[PDB]
Design a protein around this ligand. Structure first.
Ligand SMILES: Nc1ccn([C@@H]2O[C@H](COP(=O)(O)OP(=O)(O)OP(=O)(O)O)[C@@H](O)[C@H]2O)c(=O)n1
Ligand SMILES: Nc1ccn([C@@H]2O[C@H](COP(=O)(O)OP(=O)(O)OP(=O)(O)O)[C@@H](O)[C@H]2O)c(=O)n1
Ligand SMILES: O=C(c1ccc(O)cc1)c1ccc(O)c(O)c1O
Ligand SMILES: O=C(c1ccc(O)cc1)c1ccc(O)c(O)c1O
Ligand SMILES: O=C(c1ccc(O)cc1)c1ccc(O)c(O)c1O
Ligand SMILES: [Ca+2]
Ligand SMILES: [Ca+2]
Lengths: 214, 223
């Protein structure tokens, strides 16, 4: 059906690239496919979708979705800050680089020893803090994504719960590196494995349930 | 006209990805399209082509070409040295990372409150120079032409890089797609080790690959 009519959705997808010079960057391996799928499913179910996309596995701009393209984490933060006021739902599915090189050259570096790094802003935490300080009165659902693994410091669910708690978002989509939907009300739903489209359907369903209650 | 019939060519294309941990890497913005086009033109003109491809997931495999996929500069080095002894022509079109992180983490590196450590770096082996070295030392008897690529922002550094690497032909500034609003530097050259410089018109990747292969074919029959 069209159970998302009127809802303005802001989605981020793909990995960011943190330049060292015009040709080299620090990047990550995320394809952006899962975020695109959520944007497509949101748009199909009646939402006005803006998709902020970084580096993608040659993906095609989805139909009927406003596209914003970005390169680095800082440009993603600016674009989200730009469009966040008009959004009812923020879906932070982008793999945002946690650091950027301390210096960026305008011309290719030629033939060095060490790259100094500086921390990037947490865009998801910024949206959570802004909504709680009354600056995003239109925002009804903030969704983060996380890939978690168990290790010597804790099982996978322990780490996923700690992330939900630290971020403070309404829903945390957890991929167990299948996974979970962790809500801010404590509910914990297993996310059955399937294609990127099928898992997007379950995510959007979860967003819909959290909106129809609020 | 199969002017490359009976020629076995090994082509490298794409950028390498130097891992920091399982999900992060140092990479570069090379698409690999120019090397794919050289590989395609070689096969279209009769060559038996093996293509060693880096970060090029979005590109179509050229028809008639054997694909070898690699990730890092070190995997490209091992693949070239494995396949070079069977080739007659080596076309080094890959944007090979000059450096790699000195330690690759086993787990995803977690952000802390601590100040970020730097990324310590170490040089990767010069794969093109390793091939030239191996030929000079008698290990590549079948090798008839080693082709390197270079970007220099021009003829001072192009002729200089030519003699530092020691290859047979240097393609300089075969960049761009003649795309709207990309500045045409008029920087393209084909430099031969035998003393020939030819201007590379900055057109499509295909017209450039055609010019590159024309030069390889004229260099081979020169022998
Ligand atoms: N600078 C950042 C980093 C991440 N995120 C968002 O925060 C969520 C969680 O990202 P994750 O990588 O799991 O968490 P971090 O808190 O960055 O921690 P770590 O990498 O140490 O696990 C994702 O939806 C991501 O889009 C963000 O908004 N800004
Ligand atoms: N580790 C490397 C680096 C480069 N190359 C090859 O060398 C040629 C020229 O690369 P170049 O840009 O000259 O790299 P460097 O010699 O390190 O110089 P620069 O600092 O300008 O990049 C290309 O054909 C490339 O495939 C290589 O085989 N192995
Ligand atoms: O944490 C690192 C990192 C630091 C040192 C190292 O040897 C390997 C990785 C990092 C660097 C750049 C970046 O963009 C990023 O997100 C990162 O997490
Ligand atoms: O040239 C650099 C470089 C050096 C210092 C700096 O601040 C930024 C970039 C480089 C770094 C990492 C890498 O993997 C690589 O191949 C490289 O050529
Ligand atoms: O560069 C090469 C190399 C490149 C091409 C070729 O045909 C043969 C060797 C190399 C290979 C292995 C190694 O250990 C090394 O240090 C190296 O420099
Ligand atoms: Ca992170
Ligand atoms: Ca180089």
């Amino acid at each position: 059906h069209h159970d998302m009519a009127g809802v303005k959705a802001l989605v981020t997808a793909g990995g960011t690239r943190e330049p060292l010079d015009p040709v080299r960057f620090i990047g990550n391996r995320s394809s952006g496919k899962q975020g695109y799928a959520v944007a497509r499913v949101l748009a199909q179910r009646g939402a006005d979708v803006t998709l902020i996309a970084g580096n993608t596995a040659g993906l095609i701009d989805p139909a009927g979705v406003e596209m914003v393209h970005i390169g680095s984490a800082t440009q993603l933060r600016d674009a989200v800050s730009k469009h966040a006021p008009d959004a009812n739902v923020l879906v932070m599915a982008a793999a945002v680089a946690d650091f950027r090189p301390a210096h960026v050259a305008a011309a290719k570096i030629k033939k060095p020893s060490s790259i100094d790094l500086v921390r990037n802003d947490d865009v998801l935490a910024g949206a959570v803090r802004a909504r709680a300080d009354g600056q995003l009165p239109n925002m009804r659902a903030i969704v983060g994504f996380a890939a978690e693994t168990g290790d010597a410091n804790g099982d996978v669910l322990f780490h996923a719960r700690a992330k939900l708690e630290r971020k403070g978002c309404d829903l945390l989509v957890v991929n167990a590196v299948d996974g979970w939907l962790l809500s801010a009300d404590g509910t914990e739903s297993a996310l059955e494995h399937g294609s990127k489209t099928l898992m997007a359907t379950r995510i959007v369903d979860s967003i819909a349930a959290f909106l129809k209650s609020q």
